[PDB]
């Protein structure tokens, strides 16, 4: 079944805002990529994998929010007689472009925190092989329950609203579990860090927990408000949870990594940062 976007008529502002936020978190992911590729030579070689990953999750999200921008632009056309952007009769818009490119981001947003915490070799690969299982078994489960939007929302003719709940609870069951490996790789850092860079990991973890709980709120939105200004609101909180969980989180992590690479002894990070 299509999304709940194609069953509604969007006014001028209700459509312009949504395409504007699709262009905004692409002009920002094509700027974060250039920033993360320009000051990736500052972190020490030990924690430069965390800066390379940060440059990967920006190129792998620019094509995620720019291929959805095109899909949003060609799916809807203005209709002056009505006064709204009615859906076109040939193309159907689906937000599932996000959940297919969340397979490159959900793993490589905790793999770059397990790296910053100081985990090397087997201790990092084993903890990556669990997060990359918890992140492709939670997103591939929330991606099955995404297809029952018009059924949970109440569109007449569409049935199967129970699957929206069923395939949504077996996604927060892995989202909670992934936090249990992210909070045992952050409460136990390696390399004997100082008490101030040990309290910044226990901030980068809460900044990852508090931006990953906006996605359960922005999917279950057709349950609550399946309207034009419940789609406008849901593409606001999937961008305030995008530019603040792939960009702000990466920049915050690039400072706690620079603090380790300025107390271990690296000079290009000890001169350019404290
Ligand atoms: C939109 C693309 C991304 C834009 C990100 C903008 C970040 C700057 C916003 C203000 C943050 C204030 O905090 C400031 O952060 C910058 C960047 O992390 C740090 O800057 C330090 O680390 C960065 C990243 O390795 C180096 O390029 C820089 O030479 C160095 O000074 C400062 O030491 C810190 O004081
Ligand atoms: C879309 C591609 C994204 C690629 C991101 C890959 C990250 C996932 C790695 C999982 C764990 C494997 O084990 C870990 O691998 C990384 C990368 O190979 C190694 O990392 C090492 O090699 C890489 C590549 O030469 C260097 O950039 C890095 O500075 C260095 O530490 C670690 O020493 C190892 O402990
Ligand atoms: C829209 C344009 C693109 C985005 C540009 C903006 C990016 C900004 C990134 C930098 C954010 C500021 O950097 C982050 O600030 C918070 C402020 O509470 C600091 O956190 C600080 O306060 C907390 C809360 O008391 C303490 O637990 C922590 O020890 C302390 O360092 C983080 O250690 C630092 O990493
Ligand atoms: C940049 C990519 C990010 C931050 C990915 C975040 C992913 C999630 C938090 C997904 C979790 C989900 C649930 C907890 C319930 C079902 C819906 C999901 C799949 C969006
Ligand atoms: C407007 C263009 C925005 C995207 C810029 C493309 C380049 C991003 C970085 C590419 C990788 C850098 C390779 C050299 C690393 C040393
Ligand atoms: C306008 C299209 C893109 C042109 C090149 C963009 C430059 C990206 C630079 C990425 C980092 C490369 C190393 C810079 C060291 C200083
Ligand atoms: C792409 C990652 C999918 C799951 C990988 C699990 C690795 C198990 C062996 C280590
Ligand atoms: C009738 C709706 C059925 C939705 C099935 C979705 C399958 C997604 C596979 C990943
Ligand atoms: C954008 C959401 C920011 C939430 C930060 C929470 C940090 C808690 C630290 C204790
Ligand atoms: C839109 C993204 C907003 C994120 C801006 C930075 C948030 C920093 C949170 C720190 C809380 C103490």
Numbering used by the authors: 1 to 274
Manuscript excerpt for this entry:
We demonstrate the capabilities of our method by studying the dynamics of the rhodopsin ErNaR (Erythrobacter sp. HL-111), which upon light activation, pumps sodium ions from the cytoplasm across the bacterial membrane to the ouside. ErNaR belongs to a recently identified subgroup of the NDQ rhodopsins, which feature an additional glutamic acid residue close to the retinal Schiff base, allowing ErNaR to efficiently pump sodium ions even at acidic pH. Samples of ErNaR are activated with a nanosecond laser pulse of 532 nm wavelength (6 ns FWHM pulse duration, 6.4 mJ/cm2 fluence) and jet vitrified at 107 μs and 13.3 ms, to probe the K2 and O2 states, respectively.
At 13.3 ms, we observe ErNaR in the O2 state. Transient absorption spectroscopy suggests that the transition from the O1 to the O2 state is accompanied by an isomerization of the chromophore from the 13-cis back to the all-trans configuration. Indeed, Fig. 3d shows that the retinal Schiff base adopts the all-trans conformation, with the aromatic sidechains surrounding the retinal returned to their dark state positions. In the active center, the hydrogen bonding network has partially reformed. The sidechain of Asn95 rotates into the binding site, which could feasibly facilitate transient sodium ion binding. We observe a spherical density at this position, which we cannot unambiguously identify as a sodium ion due to the limited resolution of the map and which we have therefore chosen to model as a water molecule.
